[PDB]
């Protein structure tokens, strides 16, 4: 429990990287979160949208 | 079928072609959603419901 300041500085950066990675699984209104689905399912005119 | 009474077929374990469908002039309209018609021949499906 003593090194709480240093362990928190490790924890905040690990939470920031894990949040940055988890946002790769989000859709943002696209047909899939996986870019290779979109490119294997659609033609350029739909895919680029 | 009447439209209140539509008939459904499950397509079972098989290999297909969709280009014989999407290149045919027999159809007055051929829309698709979530996929391109021209791209269907690269895919596979867990089922098709017709």
Curated annotation (Swiss-Prot), chain B:
Changing residue 29 to A: In strain: Omicron/BA.2, Omicron/BA.2.12.1, Omicron/BA.4, Omicron/BA.5, Omicron/BQ.1.1, Omicron/XBB.1.5, Omicron/EG.5.1. Changing residue 28 to F: In strain: Omicron/BA.1, Omicron/BA.2, Omicron/BA.2.12.1, Omicron/BA.2.75, Omicron/BA.4, Omicron/BA.5, Omicron/BQ.1.1, Omicron/XBB.1.5, Omicron/EG.5.1. Changing residue 21 to I: In strain: Omicron/XBB.1.5, Omicron/EG.5.1. It comes from the Viruses. Changing residue 24 to L: In strain: Omicron/BA.1. Binds to host ACE2. RBD also interacts with the N-linked glycan on 'Asn-90' of ACE2. Cleavage of S generates a polybasic C-terminal sequence on S1 that binds to host Neuropilin-1 (NRP1) and Neuropilin-2 (NRP2) receptors. Interacts with host integrin alpha-5/beta-1 (ITGA5:ITGB1) and with ACE2 in complex with integrin alpha-5/beta-1 (ITGA5:ITGB1). May interact via cytoplasmic c-terminus with M protein. May interact (via N-terminus) with host bilirubin and biliverdin, thereby preventing antibody binding to the SARS-CoV-2 spike NTD via an allosteric mechanism. Attaches the virion to the cell membrane by interacting with host receptor, initiating the infection. The major receptor is host ACE2. When S2/S2' has been cleaved, binding to the receptor triggers direct fusion at the cell membrane. When S2/S2' has not been cleaved, binding to the receptor results in internalization of the virus by endocytosis using host TFRC and GRM2 and leading to fusion of the virion membrane with the host endosomal membrane. Alternatively, may use NRP1/NRP2 and integrin as entry receptors. This is Spike protein S1. It comes from Severe acute respiratory syndrome coronavirus 2. The chain holds residues 348 to 397 of 1273 of the full protein.
